[PDB]
Design a protein around this ligand. Structure first.
Ligand SMILES: NC(=O)c1ccc[n+]([C@@H]2O[C@H](COP(=O)([O-])OP(=O)(O)OC[C@H]3O[C@@H](n4cnc5c(N)ncnc54)[C@H](OP(=O)(O)O)[C@@H]3O)[C@@H](O)[C@H]2O)c1
Ligand SMILES: N[C@@H](CCC(=O)O)C(=O)O
Length: 416
């Protein structure tokens, strides 16, 4: 199924639940600027290979667009457009002065050396310089892209820009040595934890000593479990990676689980825990469940058997819309996927602010500001959910589209 068409259908479903003019919907259904460029690099053997690069800016009514760059062999122009459309709503729901943007290169980075990767980043910057900038379009790290490529890209942009302005702020996710920001490694987990705490407050639940289950034990899942156990004082009872899963009644130690996974390549055979599967984790009876792994793990097949009371969609769209309806019917409070993991883009916004201002904050200030933003966004989404009697995902979509529509109307782009 085409990603851009799914995004458009999602937008139309959201518009069904709110009062928006037809011209505004038609404007929002089309990216405002799409740039496709050729990216030529010199290979180590001396030959020149040309790659295809994309840079889609869906909307910039609220401010400069924001979005990461993907380096995937199966990259398409439609995926870029859909992800830029999603990024628009993601930055709108958390109330940032940002638009929607996305970039990508059709390349397999596993077969590229470090020098070839640097050449690719510099050539991409040289190609898309005319449509990016500190106040025009701020790229970010994404799949198969790391802060090292961000630093290379920033260096190339500063070289082209002749240091005439805040070249640090042209791109986020940079190393701390060059315009980096603190708390960029646990941004998603921190935002998810804040949203879970706000959900527990809204449901009247004391999380102290409660049970949490985390599916996926990568960067987001591990840090989410660790932060939950530390800050929320809850009991982490079960985790699971792509290989397998483990379950413990009393509770596990996430640091020990990560050490075991590093030692043996998987979380399986952990002492004091019973080896289980991802599925058995899904129907595990816990107060909070945080799927932080491969998307679409909750479908119609297993929606009715979910015993979780709070489902924090840390991953990108892990719940099927029919599964969404089934979970809403049972009275389970869900958190929209693009609202729960909005901590990363919020911390990227903080990094951009620090780069623009030339003044950098500490870990405590970043954590406090992230807490404030996540708490306010979640409370607004929940209030819309309760007032309009619609789904949480639908409420978040309504909030984001309403903000973007108001920004468009204030600019005079749409007269209705
Ligand atoms: O870097 P990353 O991205 O943070 O890794 C993604 C996380 O989700 C996990 N994952 C990927 N596919 C999965 C699957 N089909 N089922 C369950 N977990 C999955 C990964 O586990 P693995 O690191 O084990 O692949 C990892 O824990
Ligand atoms: N948060 C975005 C990435 C873009 C960014 O962090 O700036 C995503 O994972 O979809």
């Amino acid at each position: 199924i085409d990603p851009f068409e799914m995004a458009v259908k999602q937008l139309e479903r959201a518009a069904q639940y709110m009062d928006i003019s037809e011209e505004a919907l038609e404007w929002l259904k089309k990216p405002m600027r799409i740039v496709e460029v050729s990216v030529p690099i010199e290979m180590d053997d001396g030959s020149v290979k040309v790659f295809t690069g994309f840079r889609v800016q869906h909307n910039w009514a609220r401010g400069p667009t924001k979005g990461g760059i993907r380096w995937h062999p199966a990259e398409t122009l439609s995926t870029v457009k859909a992800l830029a459309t999603w990024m628009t709503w993601k930055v709108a729901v958390v109330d940032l002065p940002y638009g929607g943007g996305k970039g990508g290169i059709i390349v397999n980075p596993k077969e590229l050396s470090e020098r070839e990767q640097e050449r690719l980043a510099r050539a991409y910057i040289r190609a898309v310089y005319d449509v990016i900038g500190p106040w025009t379009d701020i790229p970010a790290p994404d799949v198969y892209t790391n802060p090292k490529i961000m630093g290379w890209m920033m260096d190339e942009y500063e070289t082209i820009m002749r240091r005439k302005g805040p070249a640090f702020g042209v791109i986020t996710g940079k190393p701390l040595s060059i315009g980096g920001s603190l708390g960029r490694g646990t941004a998603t987990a921190q935002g998810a934890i804040f949203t879970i705490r706000e959900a527990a407050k809204a449901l009247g639940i004391d999380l102290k000593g409660k049970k949490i289950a985390v599916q996926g034990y990568g960067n987001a899942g591990y840090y989410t479990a660790k932060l939950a156990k530390e800050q929320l004082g809850m009991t982490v009872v079960a985790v699971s990676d792509s290989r397998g899963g483990i379950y413990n009644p009393d509770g596990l130690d996430p640091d020990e689980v990560l050490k075991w996974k590093r030692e043996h390549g998987s979380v399986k055979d952990f002492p004091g825990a019973t080896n289980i599967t991802n599925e058995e984790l899904l129907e595990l009876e816990v107060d909070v469940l945080a799927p932080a792994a491969i998307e679409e793990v909750i479908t119609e097949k297993n929606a009715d058997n979910i015993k979780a009371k709070i489902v924090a969609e840390v991953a990108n769209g892990p719940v099927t819309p029919e599964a969404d309806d089934i979970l809403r019917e049972k009275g389970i409070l869900q958190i929209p996927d693009f609202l729960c993991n909005a901590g990363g883009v919020t911390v990227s916004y903080f990094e951009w602010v620090q780069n623009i201002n030339g003044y950098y904050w500490t870990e405590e200030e970043v954590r406090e500001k992230l807490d404030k933003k996540m708490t306010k966004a979640f409370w607004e989404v929940y209030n819309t959910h309760k007032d309009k009697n619609i789904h949480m995902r639908d409420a978040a979509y309504v909030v984001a589209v309403s903000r973007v529509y108001q920004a468009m109307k204030d600019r005079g782009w749409v007269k209705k």
